């Protein structure tokens, strides 16, 4: 919460419909009735849902918290079935959202216990891994299309090695870490550029260019992080002609990484931006490059493609 | 009955821990299968089905509501134990109390950092937000530095400032029992520290100050509070009136 | 180990780490000041400071010298020392949390096994 979780969930939906003509499903595993209804009207107000026409880009599946273990146990599958259709029948690129993946597992244990089976380590189900795999595995790219799943994860006891979370990681291809701190910088989406990771971030997969840029943005982001401590204490000045550029750039970078969502136009009074991968690499490429060193920070805040960074500077004298 | 009939009702479950135990006892005696902590597989369900019944209806239904304050008793602060885990996971937030805090003098022992309200400001009045917002911020900022105090052999005046704001605001949060205040009284007091009026005051006096200050305004200034209440916020006017009211009172105070 | 025991150390080492970290920021500050004030003067827990002189130990014009020096060296030493102390404390917080979670889990399993064991004997 506080961090743009729903808004981000809604932009993705939008962007999937837009750039891939793919639809989305939303599976609420153990949803709080209050929160469901709130999600409903939120989607609506943002368009993703349309009660008047036939322009809705999402289907909603709900397994409320009051429902018995078995129901909260299946709801994810149900949602799965739905998504599978937009892939196996119409070969699109669906989006699957499971909120939250933990409640799935938990629902599993409850059913298990009821079936009188002996729990395993930490009380989970003896079938923990299977329960998970028979589900996760349906989420892939077949020849017909592909289902992509955004799973909301809840780590128990902050223990990454807890059986529940641990099991789950066995199936994740990437993490998207929303951060309250980032949000505090006014930066949105509030995604953490250093904590968020992807398995495909391999030059062998994204290509040397993409791979290098990424690895570039990150290091700078890392370096600046170091200096952060110095700046505040010993004051921003023992900084070299070099140390002063890493900062400047980084600061521009941090901002260039923020962005206006079309979902949030309704009352942000700002037009959304759906930056293209090509435009994305280019943008960061240049900042790294030093092409816009003359440009000022605020120029990059909440824009789309670098071109906008340039124009914003204009309007900023 | 209230909820459904356009009315508003508050409910306190004290505790859900004991109830869970009652249920467990029955389950095991009936010989149903035991899970972690010997709890049946449907203990989560027992609470979820309970706690969901509370809700805010639509005018179409009467606009009536049912708010719930369920109590959970942790053990050695283990919020992650079984039953605490469920309920935490079911509710819209938590008010976390600590013994350390309590004994340290913070009463109520609310651990501000760890407590939450998913609903948030959507439930705060404009008046409160008008003050709550900056308070929340300096506190969070203090929380970052707090540990330094006791060894701050030479901190800059930047952070040294947040240490001060920190302890004062903290003192403002203290409270006696059986004496719940009106939203207008709370903002008036909060405003004092938040604006910086108590910064130069002695930490040992904030409790006394508030007491007396609030006695004064409740006595003398029932028109401003009425305003604050009514206008729902702190008008530029009432704001100025408060400035004088505290600046003069303070003066009086340190005679 | 006892979760109550590990919680103690953890509780504490968490503190020691923040203190220690705080002391360095200080030590860096004074040390900044010192490097500057040092400049001119030459044209005239603190690491292994007090000891180094101590061991080897068995006006004004120079008094201000040994002084103006012995403070750069000190504020230097304290800084690096506290830098590594928290570096240590961090390795520890990370290490202890690991033991915490192993135990935490183990405790749960051990209980559950006990239950199951007694139930199955009826």
């Amino acid at each position: 919460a506080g961090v743009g979780k729903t808004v981000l969930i809604m932009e993705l939906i939008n962007n999937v419909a837009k750039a891939h003509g793919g639809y989305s499903v939303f599976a609420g595993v153990g949803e709080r009735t209050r929160e469901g209804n709130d999600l409903y009207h939120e989607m609506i107000e943002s368009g993703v849902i349309n009660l008047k026409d036939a322009t809705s880009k999402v289907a909603l599946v709900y397994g409320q918290m009051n429902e018995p273990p078995g129901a909260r146990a299946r709801v994810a599958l149900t949602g799965l079935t739905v998504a599978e259709y937009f892939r196996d029948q119409e070969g699109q690129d669906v989006l699957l959202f499971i909120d939250n993946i933990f409640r799935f597992t938990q629902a599993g244990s409850e059913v298990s216990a009821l079936l009188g089976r002996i729990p395993s380590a930490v009380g989970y189900q003896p079938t923990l891994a299977t329960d998970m795999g028979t589900m996760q595995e349906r989420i892939t790219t077949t020849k017909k299309g592909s289902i992509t799943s955004v799973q909301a994860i809840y780590v128990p006891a902050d223990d990454l090695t807890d059986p529940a979370p641990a099991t789950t990681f066995a199936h994740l291809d990437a993490t998207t870490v929303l951060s309250r701190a980032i949000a505090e910088l006014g930066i949105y989406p509030a995604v953490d550029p250093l904590d968020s990771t992807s398995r495909i971030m391999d030059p062998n997969i994204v290509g040397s260019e993409h791979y290098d840029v990424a690895r570039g943005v990150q290091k700078i982001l890392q370096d600046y992080k170091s200096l952060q401590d110095i700046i505040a204490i010993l004051g921003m000045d023992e900084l070299s002609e070099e140390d002063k550029l890493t900062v400047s750039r980084a600061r521009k970078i941090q901002r260039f990484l923020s962005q206006p969502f079309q979902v949030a136009e309704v009352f942000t009074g700002h037009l959304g931006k759906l930056v293209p991968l090509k435009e994305t690499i280019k943008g960061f490429q240049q900042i790294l490059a030093g092409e816009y060193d003359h440009l000022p920070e605020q120029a990059f805040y909440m824009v789309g493609p670098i071109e906008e960074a340039v124009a914003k500077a204009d309007k900023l004298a | 009955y209230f909820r459904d009939n356009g009315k508003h009702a508050l409910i306190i479950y004290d505790d859900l821990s004991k109830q869970a135990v009652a249920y467990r006892q029955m389950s095991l005696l009936l010989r149903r299968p035991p899970g972690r902590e010997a709890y049946p597989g449907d203990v989560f369900y027992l609470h979820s089905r309970l706690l969901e019944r509370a809700a805010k209806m639509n005018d179409a239904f009467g606009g009536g509501s049912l708010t719930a304050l369920p109590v959970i008793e942790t053990q050695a602060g283990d919020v992650s134990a079984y039953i605490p885990t469920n309920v935490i996971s079911i509710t819209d937030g938590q008010i976390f109390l600590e013994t350390e805090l309590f004994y340290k003098g913070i009463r109520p022992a609310i651990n501000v950092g760890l407590s939450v309200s998913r609903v948030g400001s959507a439930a705060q009045t404009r008046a409160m937000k008008q003050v709550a917002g900056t308070m929340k911020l300096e506190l969070a900022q203090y929380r970052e530095v707090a540990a330094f105090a006791q060894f701050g052999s030479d901190l800059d005046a930047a952070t040294q400032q947040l240490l001060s704001r920190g302890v004062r605001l903290t003192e403002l949060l203290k409270q006696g029992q059986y004496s719940p205040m009106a939203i207008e009284e709370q903002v008036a007091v909060i405003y004092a520290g938040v604006r910086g009026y108590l910064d130069k005051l002695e930490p040992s006096k904030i409790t006394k100050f508030e007491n007396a200050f609030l006695s004064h305004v409740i006595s003398q200034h029932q028109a401003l509070l009425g305003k604050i209440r009514t206008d729902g916020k702190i008008s530029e006017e009432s704001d100025a009136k408060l400035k004088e009211i505290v600046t003069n009172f303070l003066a009086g105070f340190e005679a | 180990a006892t979760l109550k025991d590990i919680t103690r150390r953890l509780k504490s080492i968490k503190n020691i780490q923040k203190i220690t970290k705080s002391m360095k920021m200080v030590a860096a500050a004074k040390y900044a000041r010192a490097e500057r004030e040092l400049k001119p003067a030459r044209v005239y827990l603190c690491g292994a400071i007090h000891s180094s002189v101590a061991k080897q130990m068995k006006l004004a014009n120079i008094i201000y010298y040994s002084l103006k020096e012995s403070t750069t060296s000190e504020q230097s030493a304290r800084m690096t020392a506290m830098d590594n102390a928290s570096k240590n404390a961090s390795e520890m917080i990370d290490k202890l949390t690991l033991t915490f979670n192993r135990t935490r889990q183990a405790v749960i399993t051990k209980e559950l096994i006990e239950i199951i064991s007694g139930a199955a004997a009826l």
Binding site: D158 | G77, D78, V79, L114 | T7
Partner: peptide
Amino acid sequence: XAXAALXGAAXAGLA
């Protein structure tokens, strides 16, 4: 320890 779970997703960039 005991109430850590009220931080949360804290070591997330490690997963």
